[PDB]
Amino acid sequence: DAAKMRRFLFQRTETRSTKWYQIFDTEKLDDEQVVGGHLALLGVLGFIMGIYYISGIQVFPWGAPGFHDNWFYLTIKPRMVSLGIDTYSTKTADLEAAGARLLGWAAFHFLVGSVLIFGGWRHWTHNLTNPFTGRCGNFRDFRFLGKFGDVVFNGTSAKSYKEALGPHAVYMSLLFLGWGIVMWAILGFAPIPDFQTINSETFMSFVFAVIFFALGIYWWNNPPNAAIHLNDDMKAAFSVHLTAIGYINIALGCIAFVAFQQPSFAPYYKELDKLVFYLYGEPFNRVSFNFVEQGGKVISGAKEFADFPAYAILPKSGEAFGMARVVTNLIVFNHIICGVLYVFAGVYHGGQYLLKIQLNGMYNQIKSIWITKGRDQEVQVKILGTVMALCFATMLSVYAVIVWNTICELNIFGTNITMSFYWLKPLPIFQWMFADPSINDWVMAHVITAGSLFSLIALVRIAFFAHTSPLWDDLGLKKNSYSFPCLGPVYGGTCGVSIQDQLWFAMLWGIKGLSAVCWYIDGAWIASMMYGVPAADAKAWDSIAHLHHHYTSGIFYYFWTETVTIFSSSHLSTILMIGHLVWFISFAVWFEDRGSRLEGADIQTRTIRWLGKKFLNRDVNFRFPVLTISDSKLAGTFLYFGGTFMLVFLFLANGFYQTNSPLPPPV
Amino acid sequence: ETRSTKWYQIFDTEKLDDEQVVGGHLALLGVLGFIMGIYYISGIQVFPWGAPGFHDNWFYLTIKPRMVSLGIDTYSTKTADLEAAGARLLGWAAFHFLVGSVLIFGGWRHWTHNLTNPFTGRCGNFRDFRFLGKFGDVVFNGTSAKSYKEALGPHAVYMSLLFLGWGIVMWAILGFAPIPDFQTINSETFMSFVFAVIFFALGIYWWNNPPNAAIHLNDDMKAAFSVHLTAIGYINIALGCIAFVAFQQPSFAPYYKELDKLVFYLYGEPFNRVSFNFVEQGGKVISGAKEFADFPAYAILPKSGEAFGMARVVTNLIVFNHIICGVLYVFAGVYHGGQYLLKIQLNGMYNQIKSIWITKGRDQEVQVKILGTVMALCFATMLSVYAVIVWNTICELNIFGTNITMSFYWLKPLPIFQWMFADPSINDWVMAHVITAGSLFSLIALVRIAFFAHTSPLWDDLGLKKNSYSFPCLGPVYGGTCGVSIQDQLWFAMLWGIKGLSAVCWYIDGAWIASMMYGVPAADAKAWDSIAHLHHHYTSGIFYYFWTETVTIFSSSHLSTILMIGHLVWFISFAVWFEDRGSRLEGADIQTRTIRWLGKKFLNRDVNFRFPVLTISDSKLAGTFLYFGGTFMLVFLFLANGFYQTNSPLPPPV
């Protein structure tokens, strides 16, 4: 039975094979299918966007009660208020009129989404036939909306990616102009060019439509020759776009933090502090053990509050819970974690293409300064050498400051908070970047600098060591593959050497700076691991450094304070248990025990065969499966990263509890 | 033949003889006496000359109820009766310094085979000796034990002699006559003589007839040392179990329960604080503001023993210590034992051993059936009890339209077992099944070490042998083969053991185990005490344990430093336990070249360092040590933060 048993392990091996999570890969799809897939998802995205609109209705058009508050719509409510579809009004009439508008935009997105899905099926199946005029169209050569195509594109379509830039830019100016008309005609916002009103978003919707159209014609006549090697392969271009989109998303996250709490954005974001929100899963009106409410009601029982019915979600004061910043932290963090994730994948899917060329030898044939200036091994170890040195001199300079501040605050080794770095704060030149600048701001800048250079090491290694490294050229070895776990025990072992594993060590290392953001935007103290504890000098910070605000907690005391509100909620606490349960299970597949599970699975499948035969008359052969290391490090990073930030949501959605009253010394 | 020149294998049984072992054991009991004499000096509350004594330390708290029981230490609140106590502790500390110095001298010469005494000018023989002159001649027919089996009788005799000596010491020096009633310390002298009679009689029966059981254990030092460690660990677990039931018996109240009534000043505890502008002068405080104003500046503040619950904190620190070790020694006994089963399978003495402790598991057929029963029972129990805890958590959080009425509040230990618990409740039914599941879980890693040290039913299928005990894996072949050696199976017993090693910490700190969430301000978390008529209010639930217990940890500037250090140590184990060993080897190469390049350009002289990286087997070693040490550096904080269970339950909030 050895052979049959081996045909199975062979059915689950570390060698190249087809996997369910690689079927929509760029390699097996032509350029007509990428366009078709993007269209079908935007149709689904419109269907999704139309559900975030129906959910926002508080009172239905017929006047009856609607939906309870939910986080999906909350992150978009300040935008629909800004555009006039949604309105913050106590009057039930405004609440009933508003609901009709959201329902109308939801049905509209249902119609347009259905068109994009239809226009995404025919493109995918190359069945792009006009149902009215029997004649079909050509992807390579088409008129592009008839007469409009002839005047601007000389009646021709782009045959190469570098050419598609001009037409794509022209298509963008038709959206910039298209939105500038929707705002003017449907939403009633005329283009007044003053940057304190929503009317400025129509004026710049036309300025941008002019810049892009002019820029889209210059690239039609003069397509850029930069990164020509990308025009040859889809994944090469798709990865540079993803490395670019991630920095774009991080930028969007950073401006939505500065802007959403500007005075001009007060009518939409700060305005929320004066609203009562019934969030789902929040503590409801409790009832007694012997509580039976019959037709007569309130008989032979008792209930909590008595100002609301049994099992009804209780109100929540926006000012107390800090709703404004909670929403501002949920949007800013979303576009930052995603931005970081996009950058990591751009480098991964990019080095995934650098491996394909090194194997085929096209690497030495590239002429772009974007690859040529990076094929020298001496130059690589210099770039990586400086990145590692900078990462070290900055992770040790800022960690020792945080540790020293912690030691001074806890009076360890007879040291008072006076000897700590309370005098160190950002220089005067940078003081404009921060409100009430302090050591909490000097540390955060250096932590992000150290947290970027740390995860950059794993990225420079994907870019430079996809096929070979100075060590494996020394050890005479080839990295044939992007997802190979290790070469075995040899040379003290060589686990985690592929670029997919280096991607994992960028996501795992990126959890620190991805947490220095969560902690810093929630008004937490980052200069000390212990701030505000009932101990020696933790509460002396607000007056030793003269801070205008009072931070919620320090790195360690953050978990205790922020979770007082999590434990009070029956749903925020379910996330705390699920999120922790998912995270530890990563250790089972990330620890070097893949072999043990396999011999264990053998005993599992042997015992089941034994029990089934001794009890029943049938033969139970299930051949218990076990994941491979590369398949383990995959699921391991998804359980680790995916459970780590299932709970970061709880820190941001539990409320914003930074104040404006610095504490006096606990003298 | 895998290398064994590592620094942590220097004192291996292979590198030592029977004479050296005796020397090694003696060279430590002398050190242990030196240690025991420091736990005595530190416990001086007031010096003999009248100068103030030493602030409370945890090393002396776990022995103070014993020295009080023996009369060396007193609980008296008066300095006059507390000034004598100090003199006594000095007497026994100096005494243990003298006896320790003798045992080290009698260990240094034993270790160097130099058994010569200057006064008698004659060198003794290890192979044969009279044993304390005529006494041994009458009992051992003028001869000494020639083997481990023949050493049982003489070794048992020595135990009887030691017991008799302790009894004489209690009667003559400590003044406790042997009265045979089991509510007084005087019964520890009566049974010190009954045991000295049982052992002496038992030590003669084993000298005349040496035991033939486990005959192969005589042949190898590690084979016998491992069976002793599998036995000593179980003994230590039993001592921890017994000390929990006994230390809070009515007869032990004068020593353990009495701690509550005292005021303790532990080092590193909250002290009288001062203002930033504080300028203390000899005579008085000037232009300064100091908190409390009842003690001097920077003076440790008092702590009410009753609020702290020191009688149960000290009981836990001792009970858990002899259990954290008892299970570590059971794991090491199987490890060092399977470490010997690898050698007899490599040099092939296994098929010829007639011992039923090796012959019983000879055939692979039975091995799969034995491991298939440990594995099936662990599944049917770790699931039956986890689904109860999860269901109880769901019912009280009112998730999926359920209430605390639908929970497992009506499930509790059967009437036959109710005597085992002061207050029976689902918290007790779950704990018994969690320990049962937590033992069968880590037993799987132990049955593996015993049966699959060299070859498994899978490796025999894959045509492979496990040549070593500390081989990380066989490469990425067959999808991967990592963590297959018995040293790695030892790690997966220590790592898996952390759950039952935590179900004890939680359950002895008076926490709830029948629900992840107990006592939180949610729908039915606070409705437990009345739905099940609990006579006690458990401190918190499995998850809410971390929030409540840590309110006292954050208030202490030293208990919080442990929290930080303990967490820092633990996550670093991820660096050496993740499959990133190949990545570390490359990275270091860049660091060596980078440092060489920086030194080259920066200084005319070129200096290189060749940065080193640990091996996987050397990684999984430092990994388990960082994971285990980190995980129980902080379990200490749960036990030493106070015992906060109360005997008053909470009514439903409604």
Ligand code: BCL
């Ligand atoms: C998560 C960390 C990495 C990541 C790691 C990986 C890994 C690991 C793999 C891919 C693979 C793929 N990646 Mg990638 N990838 C990320 C971000 C992206 C993004 C993006 C949203 O910006 C896109 C469009 C892509 C695009 C793609 C395709 C080229 C390819 C096959 C997809 C597939 O079949 O999925 C599965 C199809 C489904 C319908 C399942 C649901 C997928 C949803 C739609 C998300 C798509 C992106 C996601 C990471 C795909 C892989 C999921 C696996 C569980 C890892 N990646 C980030 C940066 N990517 C595979 C490949 O061939 O690489 C050369 C591969 O092995």
Ligand code: BCL
């Ligand atoms: C920690 C988990 C395991 C454990 C795992 C290991 C591992 C792993 C190794 C040993 C090894 C040894 N073990 Mg063991 N061992 C444990 C418990 C014990 C106990 C006990 C206190 O009951 C004893 C007496 C021993 C005895 C010994 C020796 C036979 C041998 C060499 C010791 C040495 O040089 O240490 C180092 C000497 C020092 C002076 C350092 C300080 C050591 C102190 C005194 C504690 C001794 C026990 C400790 C586990 C030794 C190893 C420390 C390493 C860092 C792992 N083990 C528990 C059960 N043991 C080695 C061997 O050859 O095994 C075949 C080996 O590779």
Ligand code: BCL
């Ligand atoms: C949102 C709409 C989606 C889309 C969804 C559809 C739909 C819907 C249909 C097609 C179909 C067609 N698609 Mg398409 N497709 C898109 C993008 C493109 C692009 C491109 C790279 O810009 C090209 C060259 C094509 C090519 C083609 C035509 C050759 C084909 C013609 C039959 C027909 O009814 O034609 C009329 C169209 C033409 C003769 C081509 C010239 C006009 C433009 C290019 C048509 C697409 C819509 C236009 C861009 C929308 C407005 C954009 C404004 C900026 C707001 N599509 C746009 C972005 N595609 C047909 C099909 O599959 O039938 C089964 C079809 O009915």
Ligand code: BCL
């Ligand atoms: C607590 C003391 C320690 C110890 C510490 C010492 C010391 C101290 C000395 C020796 C030395 C000797 N050890 Mg030794 N050794 C121990 C255990 C043993 C055992 C054993 C397996 O029981 C044996 C056979 C030996 C063998 C020997 C003698 C042959 C040798 C003789 C020179 C001398 O001065 O002798 C007098 C002793 C004898 C002639 C042997 C017969 C008497 C017993 C066995 C001696 C040991 C002390 C005795 C057991 C203590 C009281 C036990 C009560 C229960 C309290 N030791 C005991 C348990 N060993 C000597 C040495 O190394 O000199 C450089 C020495 O001075």
Ligand code: CLA
């Ligand atoms: C909750 C976590 C968890 C669970 C259920 C298991 C379970 C198991 N492990 Mg693993 N393991 C874990 C964590 C866990 N481990 C971690 C963190 C590590 C790293 C140290 C390891 C390392 C590891 C090794 C090295 C090996 C295993 C092996 C095994 C199996 C042998 C025990 C057995 O037969 O029955 C035990 C009893 C049960 C499984 C009863 C079921 C318990 C519950 C009901 C399971 C369902 C709950 C689950 C979490 C649901 C997920 C919900 C989702 C939202 C996440 C068993 C399937 C061995 C094996 O044979 O591999 C196949 C083996 O060699 N364990």
Ligand code: CLA
């Ligand atoms: C605090 C934890 C910590 C620290 C300091 C490091 C540091 C390092 N890692 Mg590691 N790593 C960690 C956790 C950590 N890692 C974890 C949890 C994992 C698992 C995901 C990994 C996985 C891992 C891989 C896979 C790789 C490394 C690599 C590296 C090195 C490359 C970065 C560099 O050159 O300078 C970074 C900057 C510094 C080191 C500055 C120093 C920072 C402080 C001051 C260090 C001293 C504090 C320390 C905790 C003191 C201990 C006190 C004691 C009580 C515990 C670097 C030495 C790479 C390498 O080259 O290996 C050699 C590599 O391939 N990391």
Ligand SMILES: CCCCCCCCCCCCCCCC(=O)OC[C@@H](CO[C@H]1O[C@@H](CO)[C@H](O)[C@@H](O)[C@@H]1O)OC(=O)CCCCCCCCCCCCCCC
């Ligand atoms: C994967 C690894 C990386 C993870 C991803 C990191 C990307 C995020 C990128 C950092 C940006 C964070 C984003 C949120 C924006 C935000 O916060 O902006 C406002 C402002 C403070 O606002 C107020 O915040 C309150 C909260 O407590 C205060 O109380 C108050 O006093 C203060 O005024 O913050 C800064 O000025 C930003 C500091 C960081 C400074 C950046 C320095 C980096 C620049 C140099 C080079 C770095 C890159 C090196 C190469 C890799």
Ligand SMILES: CCCCCCCCCCCCCCCC(=O)OC[C@@H](CO[C@H]1O[C@@H](CO)[C@H](O)[C@@H](O)[C@@H]1O)OC(=O)CCCCCCCCCCCCCCC
């Ligand atoms: C590591 C790998 C595996 C883990 C196992 C190793 C550790 C085991 C170390 C024993 C741990 C015990 C700790 C100290 C003993 C102690 O507690 O004894 C008293 C008593 C309750 O006392 C009071 O405790 C209060 C605290 O809340 C309560 O409120 C109150 O109501 C109650 O009366 O406990 C029992 O009766 C013990 C329960 C467990 C029952 C044992 C069942 C196991 C027996 C069957 C087979 C198991 C083995 C299977 C084979 C491997």
Ligand code: SF4
């Ligand atoms: S345990 Fe995994 S990562 Fe480590 S050497 Fe073996 S196969 Fe490679």
Ligand SMILES: [Ca+2]
């Ligand atoms: Ca918060």
Ligand SMILES: [Ca+2]
């Ligand atoms: Ca406690």
